[PDB]
Structure 1
Amino acid sequence: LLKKEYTGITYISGPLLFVENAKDLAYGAIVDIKDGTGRVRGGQVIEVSEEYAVIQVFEETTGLDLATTSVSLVEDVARLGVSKEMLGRRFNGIGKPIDGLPPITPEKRLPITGLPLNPVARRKPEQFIQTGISTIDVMNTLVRGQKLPIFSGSGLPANEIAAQIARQATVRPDLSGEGEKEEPFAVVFAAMGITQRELSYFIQEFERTGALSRSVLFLNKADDPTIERILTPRMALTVAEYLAFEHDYHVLVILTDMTNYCEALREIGAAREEIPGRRGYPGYMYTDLATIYERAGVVEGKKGSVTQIPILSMP
Structure 2
Amino acid sequence: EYTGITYISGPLLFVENAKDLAYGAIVDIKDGTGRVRGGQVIEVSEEYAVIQVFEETTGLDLATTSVSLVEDVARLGVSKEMLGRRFNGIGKPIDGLPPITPEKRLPITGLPLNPVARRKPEQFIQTGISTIDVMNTLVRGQKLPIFSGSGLPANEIAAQIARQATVRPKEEPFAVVFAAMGITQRELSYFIQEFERTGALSRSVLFLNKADDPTIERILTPRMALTVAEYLAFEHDYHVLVILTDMTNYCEALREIGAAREEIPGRRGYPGYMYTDLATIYERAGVVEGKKGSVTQIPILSMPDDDRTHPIPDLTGYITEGQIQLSRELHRKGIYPPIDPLPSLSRLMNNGVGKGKTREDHKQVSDQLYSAYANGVDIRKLVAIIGEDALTENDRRYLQFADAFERFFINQGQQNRSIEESLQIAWALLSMLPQGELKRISKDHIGKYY
Deviations 1:46-103 (A, max 9, x none): 1114413233342455454447721111133432221111110010110210111111
Note the C-alpha offset of 1:135: 1.4
Q: CA RMSD in A?
A: 2.3
Which stretch of the first structure deviates more once superposed, 71-80 or 138-147?
71-80
Q: 1:167 to 1:40 in 2, by over 3 A?
A: closer
Note the C-alpha offset of 1:25: 2.5
In the alignment, the residues of structure 1 paired with residue 61 and residue 122 of structure 2 have an alpha-carbon distance, to the nearest angstrom, of: 58
In the alignment, the residues of structure 1 paired with residue 73 and residue 56 of structure 2 have an alpha-carbon distance, to the nearest angstrom, of: 23
Runs of 4+ in structure 1 off by over 6 angstroms are: 116-120
Deviations 1:256-278 (A, max 9, x none): 10111010011111122111111
Note the C-alpha offset of 1:162: 0.9
- Secondary structure (helix, strand or coil) at the match of 1:223 reads coil
- Equivalence for 1:83: 79
Could you tell me whether the CA contact under 8 Å between 2:8 and 2:14 is conserved in 1?
yes
Q: 1:200 to 1:18 in 2, by over 3 A?
A: closer
Match for 1:154 among 143, 146, 150? 150
- Secondary structure (helix, strand or coil) at the match of 1:7 reads strand
- Secondary structure (helix, strand or coil) at the match of 1:20 reads strand
Which stretch of the first structure deviates more once superposed, 242-251 or 76-85?
76-85
Note the C-alpha offset of 1:111: 0.8
In the alignment, the residues of structure 1 paired with residue 284 and residue 256 of structure 2 have an alpha-carbon distance, to the nearest angstrom, of: 24
Q: 1:304 to 1:133 in 2, by over 3 A?
A: same
Which stretch of the first structure deviates more once superposed, 153-162 or 52-61?
52-61
Could you tell me whether the CA contact under 8 Å between 1:21 and 1:51 is conserved in 2?
no
Note the C-alpha offset of 1:27: 3.5
Note the C-alpha offset of 1:130: 0.9
In the alignment, the residues of structure 2 paired with residue 203 and residue 19 of structure 1 have an alpha-carbon distance, to the nearest angstrom, of: 39
- Secondary structure (helix, strand or coil) at the match of 2:254 reads helix
Q: 1:271 to 1:300 in 2, by over 3 A?
A: same
Could you tell me whether the CA contact under 8 Å between 2:38 and 2:55 is conserved in 1?
yes
Deviations 1:208-257 (A, max 9, x none): 22111110000001111111110000000000000100001110000010
Could you tell me whether the CA contact under 8 Å between 1:35 and 1:63 is conserved in 2?
no
* Residue identity (%): 100
Report the TM-score when normalising by structure 1.
0.88
In the alignment, the residues of structure 2 paired with residue 119 and residue 252 of structure 1 have an alpha-carbon distance, to the nearest angstrom, of: 15
Note the C-alpha offset of 1:37: 4.7
Q: 1:30 to 1:22 in 2, by over 3 A?
A: farther
5+ residue gaps, structure 2: 302-450
In the alignment, the residues of structure 2 paired with residue 167 and residue 19 of structure 1 have an alpha-carbon distance, to the nearest angstrom, of: 47
Note the C-alpha offset of 1:163: 1.2
Could you tell me whether the CA contact under 8 Å between 1:23 and 1:49 is conserved in 2?
no
Q: Does 1:108 align with 2:104?
A: yes
In the alignment, the residues of structure 2 paired with residue 120 and residue 171 of structure 1 have an alpha-carbon distance, to the nearest angstrom, of: 19
- Secondary structure (helix, strand or coil) at the match of 2:93 reads coil
Normalized per residue, the structure richer in strand is: 1
Deviations 1:102-145 (A, max 9, x none): 11211111111123998994111221111111111111100100
In the alignment, the residues of structure 1 paired with residue 248 and residue 211 of structure 2 have an alpha-carbon distance, to the nearest angstrom, of: 13
Q: 1:103 to 1:21 in 2, by over 3 A?
A: closer
In the alignment, the residues of structure 2 paired with residue 87 and residue 239 of structure 1 have an alpha-carbon distance, to the nearest angstrom, of: 10
- Secondary structure (helix, strand or coil) at the match of 2:67 reads strand
Which stretch of the first structure deviates more once superposed, 237-246 or 116-125?
116-125
In the alignment, the residues of structure 1 paired with residue 122 and residue 136 of structure 2 have an alpha-carbon distance, to the nearest angstrom, of: 14
In the alignment, the residues of structure 2 paired with residue 187 and residue 168 of structure 1 have an alpha-carbon distance, to the nearest angstrom, of: 10
- Secondary structure (helix, strand or coil) at the match of 1:269 reads helix
Note the C-alpha offset of 1:10: 2.4
In the alignment, the residues of structure 2 paired with residue 282 and residue 67 of structure 1 have an alpha-carbon distance, to the nearest angstrom, of: 29
Which stretch of the first structure deviates more once superposed, 184-193 or 6-15?
6-15
Note the C-alpha offset of 1:23: 5.8
Q: How many residues align?
A: 301
Could you tell me whether the CA contact under 8 Å between 1:31 and 1:71 is conserved in 2?
no
Which stretch of the first structure deviates more once superposed, 268-277 or 12-21?
12-21
Could you tell me whether the CA contact under 8 Å between 1:130 and 1:171 is conserved in 2?
yes
In the alignment, the residues of structure 1 paired with residue 116 and residue 171 of structure 2 have an alpha-carbon distance, to the nearest angstrom, of: 29
Note the C-alpha offset of 1:206: 1.4
Normalized per residue, the structure richer in helix is: 2
- Secondary structure (helix, strand or coil) at the match of 1:56 reads strand
Could you tell me whether the CA contact under 8 Å between 2:26 and 2:73 is conserved in 1?
yes
In the alignment, the residues of structure 2 paired with residue 208 and residue 11 of structure 1 have an alpha-carbon distance, to the nearest angstrom, of: 49
Note the C-alpha offset of 1:299: 3.1
- Equivalence for 1:95: 91
5+ residue gaps, structure 1: 174-180
Deviations 1:172-225 (A, max 9, x none): 11xxxxxxx752000000001111221122122212221111100000011111
Which stretch of the first structure deviates more once superposed, 294-303 or 265-274?
294-303
Could you tell me whether the CA contact under 8 Å between 1:80 and 1:95 is conserved in 2?
yes
Q: 1:200 to 1:36 in 2, by over 3 A?
A: closer
Q: 1:196 to 1:65 in 2, by over 3 A?
A: closer
Report the TM-score when normalising by structure 2.
0.63
Note the C-alpha offset of 1:39: 4.0
Q: 1:48 to 1:110 in 2, by over 3 A?
A: same
Q: 1:116 to 1:83 in 2, by over 3 A?
A: closer
Q: 1:127 to 1:65 in 2, by over 3 A?
A: closer
- Secondary structure (helix, strand or coil) at the match of 2:285 reads coil
- Secondary structure (helix, strand or coil) at the match of 1:212 reads helix
Could you tell me whether the CA contact under 8 Å between 1:33 and 1:40 is conserved in 2?
yes
